[PDB]
């Protein structure tokens, strides 16, 4: 008799259902990987290129002028025009420290929001990497119980007559670990990519705050002279 | 017969108490899931509807005029009227830096208190997800131990005399996993749903601080001019 | 015949690939260790000496004149340049606390950025520590399953036919733990050693800030 599909098909309805469940978990844990990795890249490349241009800028006015050619989906343009918006809504004020605290707070809230929006898929990966070997073990234990009920009904004594039942059972755990391993390495790849990316976005956000903060203080000095 | 219910009927009192204990922990895990999932779909759907209405505001008075249509239990109205109350308790003071500070502290306290109250159920789920596999394990140890009692009392090697201990150890493992799996899944989905909601409520509270800070500047500038 | 080497040569191709993958993961976790142990030793040894040289400094311009002897790769020279550049960009300002806030923010981000730069390889150590037990156990379960398919096909009761297959399966767990344990230990050593290094670098960045903070307050005081 067979060693893989011969046992998979003879297997009972709950071992079948558990093995299908782990195969469904494997396909989603690889779809997330292909779906995210192309986006995260296009994000990492695009933001790195924008930071390399913005790092030359000497004032928030100059930074706006060079950022304006970036696409509507640009993260850095979506920070620069927000620091401009906070200054524009505040234009009746003479409290420069008040403009700095509001802009610092608003920029931090948006950097966190992009961080939450990049990390959207990780709940599946972190869950599937934790539960999937235990889900396999449940399939194996119930498979052993069905084989054990099978012997206790016919009271057999031949080691070979139990061998195919105990094999199928182990396959469930084998499929459980095969679903688990990708989800743990894929989770760690995105956990490290998120850490590097949120920090790189944070350095662009920090440059916007530094440009605004320095520009306001120099403008106040030039006014008071 | 020798059925799975016959296997429960034959099991020792200690293993019955492990199984019954884990079944009660399982049903209350689903009871608190069905309760909190509805309460997290209600509050999040409502709060998303507030932020989108409230995002129109350009002064704290206009934010109050928008929020006045919100119900008595609305979290955003319950943040607006904290900022309003800190101003109304403070009319005798011209230290706007103090009004902003005291208001920011009240609003930070309230966002934490809502998140703290929203998490009420998670301590149970986090306990069952960690503990229930080891409660299962204790039942398996008791089953394996009772197997060795069976052979020690009968000095005979056969499957039929160890059978009660294998039966107990399988049932204790299966029910242990059946308690553990949904508890660790549900704890993850609620930890994700609370982390998102608490941050989203923080983004609503931040808007209240921005509006109040802006209003006090424009008022102070108009008074100086 | 059945040495441990013969036990690998007779095993199934799936568990043989599991054993080779765990040996290569072992080669990587030791190559990362010998690479980073020397690097963190040299950076720790240098930075600890730069801090001793800077401990004598009384004002930021004197700290620059000390640090000009440091090589262009030195982290303390980099920090001092991150401070001096916030002065030269602010030259028109009469507000000093804006120079203090902007400098504190730049140096805090630089210390975090260096601390993160230390960690480049640790994703491999964390992954290899986490998955190597699971990769070993997959090898064990596959070998055991294959042996019971052997018993179902050859229809033979004797467990002595299964004993080679159990040894082949347990060897995959043994090699799994030999790959896991060094990676888990070394990841914890480097996580603690990076935390210690970030704190030592933060103590240098704090001296740069304290020097600048006195220097500005004394200059603004002496102007009136």
């Amino acid at each position: 008799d067979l060693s893989v599909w011969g046992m998979y098909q003879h297997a009972d309805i709950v071992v079948k259902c558990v093995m299908i469940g782990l195969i469904l978990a494997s396909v989603v844990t690889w779809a997330i990987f292909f779906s995210k990795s192309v986006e995260f890249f296009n994000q990492k490349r695009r933001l790195k290129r924008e930071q390399q241009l913005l790092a030359e800028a000497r004032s928030l006015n100059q930074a706006n002028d060079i950022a304006a050619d970036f696409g509507s989906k640009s993260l850095s343009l979506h920070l620069l025009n927000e620091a401009q918006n906070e200054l524009e809504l505040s234009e009746g004020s003479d409290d420069n420290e008040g403009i700095k605290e509001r802009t610092s707070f608003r920029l931090e809230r948006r950097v966190a929001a992009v961080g939450r929006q990049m990390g959207r898929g990780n709940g599946y990966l972190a869950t599937i990497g934790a539960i999937s070997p235990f889900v396999g073990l449940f399939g194996t234990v119930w498979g052993i119980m069905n084989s054990f009920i099978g012997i206790a009904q016919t009271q057999t004594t031949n080691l070979a007559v139990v061998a195919p039942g105990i094999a199928e059972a182990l396959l469930a755990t084998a499929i459980g670990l095969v679903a688990a391993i990708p989800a743990v390495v894929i989770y760690n790849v995105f956990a490290r990519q998120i850490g590097g990316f949120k920090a790189m976005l944070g350095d662009v956000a920090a440059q916007v705050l530094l440009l605004q903060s320095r520009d306001l203080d120099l403008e106040a000095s030039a006014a008071a002279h | 017969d020798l059925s799975v219910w016959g296997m429960y009927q034959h099991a020792d009192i200690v293993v019955k108490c492990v199984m019954i204990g884990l079944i009660l922990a399982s049903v209350v895990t689903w009871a608190i899931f069905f309760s909190k999932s509805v309460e997290f779909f209600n509050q999040k759907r409502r709060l998303k509807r507030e932020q989108q209405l409230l995002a129109e505001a350009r002064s704290l008075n206009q934010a109050n005029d928008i929020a006045a249509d919100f119900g008595s239990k609305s979290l955003s109205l319950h943040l607006l009227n904290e900022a309003q109350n800190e101003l109304e308790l403070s009319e005798g003071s011209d230290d706007n830096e103090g009004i902003k500070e005291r208001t920011s502290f009240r609003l930070e306290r309230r966002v934490a208190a809502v998140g703290r109250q929203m998490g009420r159920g998670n301590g149970y789920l986090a306990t069952i997800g960690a503990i229930s596999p080891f409660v299962g394990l204790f039942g398996t140890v008791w089953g394996i131990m009772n197997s060795f009692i069976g052979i020690a009392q009968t000095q005979t090697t056969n499957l039929a005399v160890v059978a009660p201990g294998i039966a107990e150890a399988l049932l204790a493992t299966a029910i242990g996993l059946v308690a553990a799996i949904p508890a660790v899944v549900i704890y993850n989905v609620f930890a994700r749903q609370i982390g998102g909601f608490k941050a989203m409520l923080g983004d609503v509270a931040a808007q209240v601080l921005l509006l109040q800070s802006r209003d006090l500047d424009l008022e102070a500038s108009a008074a100086a001019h | 015949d059945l040495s441990v080497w013969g036990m690998y040569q007779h095993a199934d191709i799936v568990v043989k690939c599991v054993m080779i993958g765990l040996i290569l993961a072992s080669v990587v976790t030791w190559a990362i260790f010998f690479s980073k142990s020397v690097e963190f030793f040299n950076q720790k040894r240098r930075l600890k000496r730069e801090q001793q040289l800077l401990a004598e400094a009384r004002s930021l311009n004197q700290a620059n004149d000390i640090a000009a002897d440091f090589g262009s790769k030195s982290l303390s020279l980099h920090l001092l340049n991150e401070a001096q550049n916030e002065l030269e960009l602010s030259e028109g300002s009469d507000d000093n606390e804006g120079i203090k806030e902007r400098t504190s923010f730049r140096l805090e981000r630089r210390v975090a950025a260096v601390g993160r730069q230390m960690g480049r390889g640790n994703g491999y150590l964390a992954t290899i520590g986490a998955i190597s037990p699971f990769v070993g156990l997959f090898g064990t379960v596959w070998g055991i399953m294959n042996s019971f398919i052997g018993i179902a096909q050859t229809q033979t009761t004797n467990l002595a036919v299964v004993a080679p297959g159990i040894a082949e399966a347990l060897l995959a767990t043994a090699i799994g733990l030999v790959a896991a344990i060094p990676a888990v230990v070394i990841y914890n050593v480097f996580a603690r050693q990076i935390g210690g290094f970030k704190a030592m670098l933060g103590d240098v960045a704090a001296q740069v800030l304290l020097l600048q903070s006195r220097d500005l307050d004394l200059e603004a005081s002496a102007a009136a």
Binding site: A126, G129, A130, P133, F134, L137, T140, I144, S147, F148, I151, T156, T157, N158, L159, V162, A163, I166, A169, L170, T173, A180, V184, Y187, N188, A191, R192, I194, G195 | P133, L137, T140, I144, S147, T157, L159, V162, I166, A169, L170, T173, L177 | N122, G123, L125, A126, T127, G129, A130, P133, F134, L137, T140, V141, I144, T157, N158, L159, V184, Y187
Partner: peptide
């Protein structure tokens, strides 16, 4: 980073329990 970097041992304890129970059934029958 929330990188998973530690051995959660319970899967093993439970797969070794499976391995024990399997032979604890088959061996007294052989």
């Amino acid at each position: 980073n929330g990188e998973m970097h530690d051995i959660n041992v319970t899967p093993f304890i439970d797969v070794m329990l499976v391995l024990l129970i399997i032979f604890m059934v088959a061996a007294p029958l052989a």
